[PDB]
Amino acid sequence: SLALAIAITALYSAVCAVGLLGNVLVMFVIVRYTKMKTATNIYIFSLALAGALATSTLPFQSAKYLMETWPFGELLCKAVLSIDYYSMFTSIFTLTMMCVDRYIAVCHPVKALDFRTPAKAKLINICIWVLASGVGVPIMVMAVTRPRDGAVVCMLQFPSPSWYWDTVTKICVFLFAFVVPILIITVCYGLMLLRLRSVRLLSGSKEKDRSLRRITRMVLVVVVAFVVCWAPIHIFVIVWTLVDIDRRDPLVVAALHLCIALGYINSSLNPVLYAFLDENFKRCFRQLC
């Protein structure tokens, strides 16, 4: 019981620390050394910024878990929920546009000359943040603070029936944040891998086949990590919304915090991993060392 609590608090603290420091280091290396020439590095910078914004939310959640009540107030409750949803949608849309950019780069090379420019990539990223603000505003409006059973809880207030609009909201978030990006990324990467076999440099030799294996593994790790991290929290939250059972039981809450921790790991740690997968990012440290 007590060890479970301290273990979950240590997990949140470790994820917050490593994610925030990694995102700050990635943004620092991108600004100082790369200078945002490549459009892909601009996308990585936007993804790291969204990951750091998601990472910032975690200490308030850990403090609420330890205190077992919310003393921070309604306005900060609104800020926490708005930043959480805004950062999540920004990160997912940025990753989807990264995969679309790689698809357009490989499969349509003549079109890529016109399409891929730093100014257009910056415009697309600014449009992503502005459209994510449209998601962010109703979460800020709906969020309220109410006292329940002698304790204060931060939550979202839905219009009547609350369960129905809550369920519709969870299904819409599940659909647009999970199913459509997996579809776009899987189709783009599949067509990209089908295109890559024709290339003479990637075929006809053992070393070339090993290079194709490396490219295939680096491509598929993104899809595998995205599915593995996002699916349990979405499924558990939908089941939580449908079932009416009390949250007094510690084990179910602990599993819920593990799923939330996996979602924040995908939000924060995986942009750092995507940055480390880049050969140029390795090359900068290799030249420096």
């Binding site: 959640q61 609420k64 929920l81 949803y85 929290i233 939250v237 939580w240 949250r247 939330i260 979602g263």
Partner: peptide, 7 residues
């Protein structure tokens, strides 16, 4: 994502 269900 999931702060609203823990409370």
């Amino acid at each position: 994502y999931x702060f609203e269900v823990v409370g």
